[PDB]
Design a protein around this ligand. Structure first.
Ligand SMILES: [Mg+2]
Ligand SMILES: [Mg+2]
Ligand SMILES: [Mg+2]
Ligand SMILES: [Mg+2]
Lengths: 271, 286
């Protein structure tokens, strides 16, 4: 059973979320299997960001057991701004564990947009099916897997990218727009997509996902060209960086959400 | 100074919010002056629903001192559903006090009777408001919604404290500083009850947002309707509670109605059913 352990108050520099297996902290990057069911390509997704929230939460590669923390720039917490007509993130946003875009590879687990009805929670491990994939150029190659929770009411009817057009008309357009503009309020440029923004299909997506799993397998085995990245894990006994003690060194669960500055409410008109 | 008195937990049937002056409840319908500053057309807006929320909190016309309570549909809490690409209400949503969309006459602009509520207000500023807030706003324009066939004007307004308020003086300025918002507003009020099983709404004037001058005229009309109502002179007051603590010349004035209200019993927000998360796609598929 996977649960979460929260350190500190949400929306602070101290906040961290660790994933627990049967009460014990594990690495969110290394210890969660990529596959929940390999034969049927059911993936475990680590969720970072609930739909319609702003705090830019991510698995941090450089801290032991790779907790989810809030991104910062020059000591300030990062919140993605509201870009009309969007509110915060328009997907449940997360990553596939045991993946790594080996760096042009973007130096992180592959990103996952989960499109189901239920709003997810930070540190949630859900099981998803891949429907397709888009290639954002952010600055670097930054694939976005389009996926759905297998528990979603619609999941049996969604198997490939054309089903997203059928059941979620306009979501692909919104996704294109969102990733193009979302850093414009921060004073960064518009992003660009390869393939004129087209979402490639499931088959194409599985190929890209497999590749990044293979890179991570070389990473965790200590055979990568890995500076900055903590490879401590507590479930892979034959890896150089296995250390069960790491799980025990994590502090106990901590607080109520800290307030978010009212500026984050603002709706920006840059569409 | 206006404050709130909360009874119970948000997102429950027991939740009530009374507006207080001097720490004592007043009628949110009748006792808050329409004008904060009549000479400069600055209005008091009672906020019901914060931007990007769902719970359909509204002034309760039939309850003494008209606290804000969550609407119910056949006994269950009513939450407005998320209609793609929108998240809940896309404005701070509330009402002008001391107004009424008169349900007893056909309004000539729409050829329909009024919806029986205070005139509705869409406050477009950056800061997300809170339920029971009384804020001061300027009117910028107005749209003529037919809500299930009833006259249901929507005033477009801005908090006077918004950083942009000095630059927003008429409806054209909304398109300049908030491009796309009026078009989204038209869509939102057309489609928002489709997930409830209701038909699409329609607007008069092909959804044009009429200007500030037009808005002031309609707001005046609704204030005049309310004056008749509160004086006990409506042909049909629809069982509206007319109890008030500030209008001595009205038949239902009662300063002590305030004393009878229970004290605050604020509890933490109750959880909302995960169904309310759902994003509804109403058309546009290839
Ligand atoms: Mg980043
Ligand atoms: Mg990436
Ligand atoms: Mg109603
Ligand atoms: Mg109305």
């Amino acid at each position: 059973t996977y649960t979460t352990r929260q350190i500190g108050a949400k929306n602070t520099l101290e906040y961290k979320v660790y994933i627990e297996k049967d009460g014990k902290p594990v690495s969110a990057f290394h210890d969660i299997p990529l596959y929940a069911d390999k034969e049927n390509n059911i993936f475990n997704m680590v969720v970072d960001i609930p739909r319609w929230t702003n705090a830019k939460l991510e698995i941090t590669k450089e801290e032991t057991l790779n907790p989810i923390i809030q991104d910062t720039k020059k000591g300030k917490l990062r919140f993605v701004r509201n870009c009309f007509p969007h509110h915060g993130y328009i997907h449940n946003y997360g990553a596939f564990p045991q993946t790594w875009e080996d760096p042009v590879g973007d130096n992180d687990p592959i990103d996952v947009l989960e499109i189901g009805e239920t709003i997810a929670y930070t540190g949630q491990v859900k099981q998803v099916k891949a429907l397709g994939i888009m290639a954002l150029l952010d600055e670097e190659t930054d694939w976005k897997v389009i996926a759905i929770d297998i528990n979603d009411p619609l999941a049996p009817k969604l198997n490939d990218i054309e089903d997203v057009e059928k059941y979620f008309p306009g979501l692909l357009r919104a996704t294109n727009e969102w990733f193009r503009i979302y850093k414009i309020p921060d004073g960064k440029p518009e992003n660009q997509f390869a393939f004129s923004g087209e979402a490639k299909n499931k088959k194409y997506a599985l190929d890209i996902i497999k590749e990044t799993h293979d890179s991570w397998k070389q990473l965790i085995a200590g055979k990568s060209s890995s500076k900055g990245i903590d490879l401590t894990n507590v479930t892979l006994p034959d890896t150089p960086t296995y250390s069960k003690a790491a799980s025990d060194a994590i502090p106990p669960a901590s607080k109520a959400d800290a307030p978010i500055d009212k500026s984050i409410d603002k709706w920006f008109f840059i569409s």
